[PDB]
Amino acid sequence: GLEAKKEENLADWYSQVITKSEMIEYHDISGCYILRPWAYAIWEAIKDFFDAEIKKLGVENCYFPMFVSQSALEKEKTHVADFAPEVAWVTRSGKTELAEPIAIRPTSETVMYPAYAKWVQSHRDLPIKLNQWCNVVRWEFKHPQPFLRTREFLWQEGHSAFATMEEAAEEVLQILDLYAQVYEELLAIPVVKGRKTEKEKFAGGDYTTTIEAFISASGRAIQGGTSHHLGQNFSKMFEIVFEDPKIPGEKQFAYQNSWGLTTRTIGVMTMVHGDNMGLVLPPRVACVQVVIIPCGILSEEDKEALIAKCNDYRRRLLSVNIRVRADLRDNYSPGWKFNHWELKGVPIRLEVGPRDMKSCQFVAVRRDTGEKLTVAENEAETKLQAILEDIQVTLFTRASEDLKTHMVVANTMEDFQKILDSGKIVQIPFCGEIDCEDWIKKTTARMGAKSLCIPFKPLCELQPGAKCVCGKNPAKYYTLFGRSY
Amino acid sequence: LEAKKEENLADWYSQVITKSEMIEYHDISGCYILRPWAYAIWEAIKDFFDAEIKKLGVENCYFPMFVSQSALEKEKTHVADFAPEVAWVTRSGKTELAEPIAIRPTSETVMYPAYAKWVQSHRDLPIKLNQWCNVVRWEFKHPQPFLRTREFLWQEGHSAFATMEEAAEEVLQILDLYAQVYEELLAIPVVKGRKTEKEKFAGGDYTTTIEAFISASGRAIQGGTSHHLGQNFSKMFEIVFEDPKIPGEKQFAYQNSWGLTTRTIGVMTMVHGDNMGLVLPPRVACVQVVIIPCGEDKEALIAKCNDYRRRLLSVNIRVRADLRDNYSPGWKFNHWELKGVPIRLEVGPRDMKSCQFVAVRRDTGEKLTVAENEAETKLQAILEDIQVTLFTRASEDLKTHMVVANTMEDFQKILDSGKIVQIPFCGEIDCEDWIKKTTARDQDLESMGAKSLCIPFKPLCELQPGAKCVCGKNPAKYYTLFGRSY
Numbered sequence: 003g004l005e006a007k008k009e010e011n012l013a014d015w016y017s018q019v020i021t022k023s024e025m026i027e028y029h030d031i032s033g034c035y036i037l038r039p040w041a042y043a044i045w046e047a048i049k050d051f052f053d054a055e056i057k058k059l060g061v062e063n064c065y066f067p068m069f070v071s072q073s074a075l076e077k078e079k080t081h082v083a084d085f086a087p088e089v090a091w092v093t094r095s096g097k098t099e100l101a102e103p104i105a106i107r108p109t110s111e112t113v114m115y116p117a118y119a120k121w122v123q124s125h126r127d128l129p130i131k132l133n134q135w136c137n138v139v140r141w142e143f144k145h146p147q148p149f150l151r152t153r154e155f156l157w158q159e160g161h162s163a164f165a166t167m168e169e170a171a172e173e174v175l176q177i178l179d180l181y182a183q184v185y186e187e188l189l190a191i192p193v194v195k196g197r198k199t200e201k202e203k204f205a206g207g208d209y210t211t212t213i214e215a216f217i218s219a220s221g222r223a224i225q226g227g228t229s230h231h232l233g234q235n236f237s238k239m240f241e242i243v244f245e246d247p248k249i250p251g252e253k254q255f256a257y258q259n260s261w262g263l264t265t266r267t268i269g270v271m272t273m274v275h276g277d278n279m280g281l282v283l284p285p286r287v288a289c290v291q292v293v294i295i296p297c298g299i300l301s302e303e304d305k306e307a308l309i310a311k312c313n314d315y316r317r318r319l320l321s322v323n324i325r326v327r328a329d330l331r332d333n334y335s336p337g338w339k340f341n342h343w344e345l346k347g348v349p350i351r352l353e354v355g356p357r358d359m360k361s362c363q364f365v366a367v368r369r370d371t372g373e374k375l376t377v378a379e380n381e382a383e384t385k386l387q388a389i390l391e392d393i394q395v396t397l398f399t400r401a402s403e404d405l406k407t408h409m410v411v412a413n414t415m416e417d418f419q420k421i422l423d424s425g426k427i428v429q430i431p432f433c434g435e436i437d438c439e440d441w442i443k444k445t446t447a448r449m450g451a452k453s454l455c456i457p458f459k460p461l462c463e464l465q466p467g468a469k470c471v472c473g474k475n476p477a478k479y480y481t482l483f484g485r486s487y
Numbered sequence: 488l489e490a491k492k493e494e495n496l497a498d499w500y501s502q503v504i505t506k507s508e509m510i511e512y513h514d515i516s517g518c519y520i521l522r523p524w525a526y527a528i529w530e531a532i533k534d535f536f537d538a539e540i541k542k543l544g545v546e547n548c549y550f551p552m553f554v555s556q557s558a559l560e561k562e563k564t565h566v567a568d569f570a571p572e573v574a575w576v577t578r579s580g581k582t583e584l585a586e587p588i589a590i591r592p593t594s595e596t597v598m599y600p601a602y603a604k605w606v607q608s609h610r611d612l613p614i615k616l617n618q619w620c621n622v623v624r625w626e627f628k629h630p631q632p633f634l635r636t637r638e639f640l641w642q643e644g645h646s647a648f649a650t651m652e653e654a655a656e657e658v659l660q661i662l663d664l665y666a667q668v669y670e671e672l673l674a675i676p677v678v679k680g681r682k683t684e685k686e687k688f689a690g691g692d693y694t695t696t697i698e699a700f701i702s703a704s705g706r707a708i709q710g711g712t713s714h715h716l717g718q719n720f721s722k723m724f725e726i727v728f729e730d731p732k733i734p735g736e737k738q739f740a741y742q743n744s745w746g747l748t749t750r751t752i753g754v755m756t757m758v759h760g761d762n763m764g765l766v767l768p769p770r771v772a773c774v775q776v777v778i779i780p781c782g783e784d785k786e787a788l789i790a791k792c793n794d795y796r797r798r799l800l801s802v803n804i805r806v807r808a809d810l811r812d813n814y815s816p817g818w819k820f821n822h823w824e825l826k827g828v829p830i831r832l833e834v835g836p837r838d839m840k841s842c843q844f845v846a847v848r849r850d851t852g853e854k855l856t857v858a859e860n861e862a863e864t865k866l867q868a869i870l871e872d873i874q875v876t877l878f879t880r881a882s883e884d885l886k887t888h889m890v891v892a893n894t895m896e897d898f899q900k901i902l903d904s905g906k907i908v909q910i911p912f913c914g915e916i917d918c919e920d921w922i923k924k925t926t927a928r929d930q931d932l933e934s935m936g937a938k939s940l941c942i943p944f945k946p947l948c949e950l951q952p953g954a955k956c957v958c959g960k961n962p963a964k965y966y967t968l969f970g971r972s973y
């Protein structure tokens with residue numbers, strides 16, 4: 003059972019949920035954590051959904067080397083300047099120092115695009131759509147947290163190159179909607195689409211799209227995923243050129259995109275849905291949606307009938323494609339199994355006792371609400387299918403309910419401060435300049451609010467002639483601000 | 488293709504991996520790009536292997552890629568054979584780290600500190616974990632794609648048991664899965680065996696292995712490893728479990744480790760490829776059938792090509808229709824022949840009108856005319872026969888190039904004809920060093936010495952009582968498969 007409470011010390015509560023659900027194990031290297039099968043099954047459920055959707059878009063899977071030459075890093079100066087401090091360098095082979103150190107990729111733009119230049123020669127060679135599921139190392143000296151901010155993490159990174167900028171722009175918005183589907187349709191988490199500001203965008207690119215989720219217990223928001231439009235900045239310095247289809251001899255730089263989604267999705271799932279009895283797995287991503295546990299255990303003949311009914315319930319649920327597992331381990335107490343699968347977040351626990359079986363009834367226990375329903379054997383697969391749909395809805399409904407009440411609009415730095423101190427997120431009219439974004443972070447700390455995203459669909463239309471909260475420059479858009487990981 | 492496989496095998500392999508769009512070279516010496524054409528083979532290998540080990544109780548996970556500086560100090564023999572083959576990270580940007588972290592050449596030192604915390608009772612056993620990840624081995628030898636690479640993709644499974652009997656069973660259970668990958672998926676016969684004390688995984692009990700043979704070069708190659716580690720690692724990391732009957736007494740768990748790398752794709756290329764490019768077994772082929780139009784009437788031709796496409800997709804046959812109007816049909820013919828597509832389905836206007844098509848076999852080049860209503864069944868018969876043809880052709884060259892010799896002179900004359908030989912071996916390490924020296928010096932072939940490949944479980948002939956090794960001095964313990972290796 004858990005120790006620390008979520009409302010109290012959230013940090014120790016988050017560490018207790020990921021360990022006692024058997025998702026995360028620690029490692030003697032700070033910032034690096036172990037993905038145990040219970041956590042890895044969720045990332046595979048996200049992988050199979052995202053891989054199937056991007057393959058429809060013509061995206062193909064591959065794998066590129068993990069070592070970056072120092073010659074390829076300095077190709078894009080702006081891109082290498084923002085990633086320079088968090089690039090882990092290999093400097094020794096065994097015990098002697100390498101004559102030339104090599105870098106571990108925080109991102110493989112400079113690994114793939116040198117090859118993109120060799121492959122792109124004509125218009126027929128476009129569009130290239132490559133993606134890889136791999137690990138990357140970003141050595142941030144901030145104090146890490148599992149899933150939320152790790153120094154090594156798994157992700158997918160797609161790198162697409164187009165002949166025109168129209169198709170490159172429409173793929174960014176489609177990958178962003180796929181990222182939003184993962185959070186809203188699989189993890190039951192509401193997100194806010196938006197564009198990153200000139201300060202919080204991918205250096206070396208054109209613009210950055212992102213999805214931001216809100217964690218009610220901490221009052222902070224977090225970037226769930228990013229889809230970037232690179233334009234021609236990388237193709238200019240990597241010489242990714244192709245011949246014109248109609249005009250002979252004429253050449254044009256390719257328009258490129260890059261999009262990534264990391265294992266942070268799992269930690270956001272726990273921070274939003276996890277309570278004080280452990281984890282809560284959304285039914286769409288729960289590898290075990292229903293668990294059958296026999297209880298009430300005298301006679302050895304009725305015991306053989308109690309185990310047969312549990313098998314009968316498993317076969318009745320597997321027929322309607324419900325992921326059900328029967329925990330029939332005699333070496334464990336039935337009360338032990340209840341608290342075990344509860345910490346792991348199984349949506350429904352199916353209790354079958356000898357008295358309940360003789361009464362043609364079973365007990366379904368909902369993980370999200372804790373409610374107890376004595377369902378009949380005939381209405382098993384129907385109600386259990388109906389309860390599975392209800393848990394996914396309730397998790398999204400109440401998480402979006404906290405989003406609807408903690409995302410308010412303010413127009414003055416006085417309201418901006420008091421609202422932020424109550425653990426909420428604010429939409430403000432913003433000028434967009436970087437030096438004003440620096441002023442907002444320094445002033446709100448006296449910690450410090452950061453820009454989260456410029457919502458595509460803000461809560462209110464920006465009033466004509468309205469100035470930013472700086473008062474010096476006019477406001478260009480409503481921008482979402484708040485404290486973030 | 489500019490070179491031939493029988494002529495210069497090195498230049499042929501480099502052109503086949505590139506012109507098949509499987510491998511792209513990188514700036515880093517030893518690093519190679521796994522393009523989608525080669526990557527689809529690895530995904531076909533992994534989704535078969537995952538489905539098998541999941542039946543054995545293995546679950547997938549992922550461990551960090553960095554290992555502590557003191558975690559390697561816990562191991563003496565493991566840090567002895569991995570002494571010259573480990574990369575170290577000491578800087579993040581322009582700042583020094585707390586301690587040098589090492590990129591995993593293998594994750595024994597990463598996973599086992601976690602096993603000790605998880606394993607506290609007998610109910611915690613057995614633990615069966617597996618991960619698909621990348622590994623950096625700083626081998627100062629020869630970076631060749633798939634075969635010998637500094638960085639490569641693999642799977643590593645680490646099991647821990649309470650009994651040694653179940654650990655001994657899983658070592659050979661996994662080894663038999665590695666043999667099915669080469670034989671049933673890649674159509675490559677292999678030799679099950681045990682590695683000698685010289686080539687074994689240092690720090691474990693014994694190492695079982697599968698060895699494949701390449702006719703175009705006479706050199707053999709190891710295709711997979713399944714080690715029994717005994718209680719060696721469990722005593723360093725203190726992986727202990729309480730006895731389920733005796734109060735207080737604890738025992739060290741018995742552990743195994745087994746790995747299979749992307750070298751699978753390299754052996755498939757060398758064994759099945761010919762002077763016309765790559766040759767893909769239909770079981771792992773990214774595209775099994777490519778439809779090529781050989782030509783108003785154009786709308787019906789593009790339709791009939793797409794109709795074979797959906798019909799093959801209906802029966803779950805991997806198919807791609809090449810309808811590019813920029814290239815001639817013959818260009819597409821040699822394009823997909825270089826990429827190794829097993830069946831090339833040609834549709835001409837005359838073929839369409841008479842309700843027929845021409846399916847050619849990549850392995851033999853024969854052109855088969857099939858009626859339209861037999862497209863689903865006949866093509867599956869041709870694909871199934873291409874699979875058995877490649878394996879039987881490979882099995883014929885293994886049975887003809889793996890022969891037994893009993894003397895050192897016969898071993899040398901047979902080995903230098905491009906063969907691999909099973910000889911009576913004593914097992915001594917310094918005797919294995921001497922075999923490598925004599926076979927390299929007295930090489931009267933057409934330069935490298937003979938290396939120990941494996942100790943076969945089922946040798947061609949049983950060893951005679953009191954038989955002496957090829958060294959003459961020490962007695963022989965077993966027949967050992969010898970030959971030049973990669």
Ligand SMILES: Cc1ccccc1CNc1nccnc1C(N)=O
Pocket residue numbers: 140142149150151152153154155225226227228262263264265266
């Ligand atoms: C959401 C997203 C998209 C693209 C790139 C990075 C991220 C988030 N970043 C992380 N995610 C998980 C762990 N650690 C980190 C990190 N330290 O940056």
Ligand SMILES: Cc1ccccc1CNc1nccnc1C(N)=O
Pocket residue numbers: 624626633634635636637638639709710711712746747748749750
């Ligand atoms: C086949 C096998 C199984 C288990 C462990 C190691 C290997 C061989 N190792 C490699 N495999 C592919 C690329 N490079 C290498 C290397 N340089 O070690």
Ligand code: PRO
Pocket residue numbers: 108109110111158159160204228230260261262263
């Ligand atoms: O790191 C990023 O955010 C982008 C998207 C994946 C590759 N590079």
Ligand code: PRO
Pocket residue numbers: 592593594595642643644688712714744745746747
């Ligand atoms: O390096 C090796 O050979 C073993 C096999 C997988 C885990 N480590």
Ligand SMILES: [Sr+2]
Pocket residue numbers: 060061062129131
């Ligand atoms: Sr494509």
Ligand SMILES: [Sr+2]
Pocket residue numbers: 252253
């Ligand atoms: Sr021009």
Ligand SMILES: [Sr+2]
Pocket residue numbers: 252253254255
């Ligand atoms: Sr131009």
Ligand SMILES: [Sr+2]
Pocket residue numbers: 474475476
């Ligand atoms: Sr102004």
Ligand SMILES: [Sr+2]
Pocket residue numbers: 544545546613614615
């Ligand atoms: Sr298991």
Ligand SMILES: [Sr+2]
Pocket residue numbers: none
């Ligand atoms: Sr003792």
Ligand SMILES: [Sr+2]
Pocket residue numbers: 736737738
């Ligand atoms: Sr003991």
Ligand SMILES: [Zn+2]
Pocket residue numbers: 432433434435438470471472473474475
């Ligand atoms: Zn401003």
Ligand SMILES: [Zn+2]
Pocket residue numbers: 912913914915918956957958959961
């Ligand atoms: Zn000898």
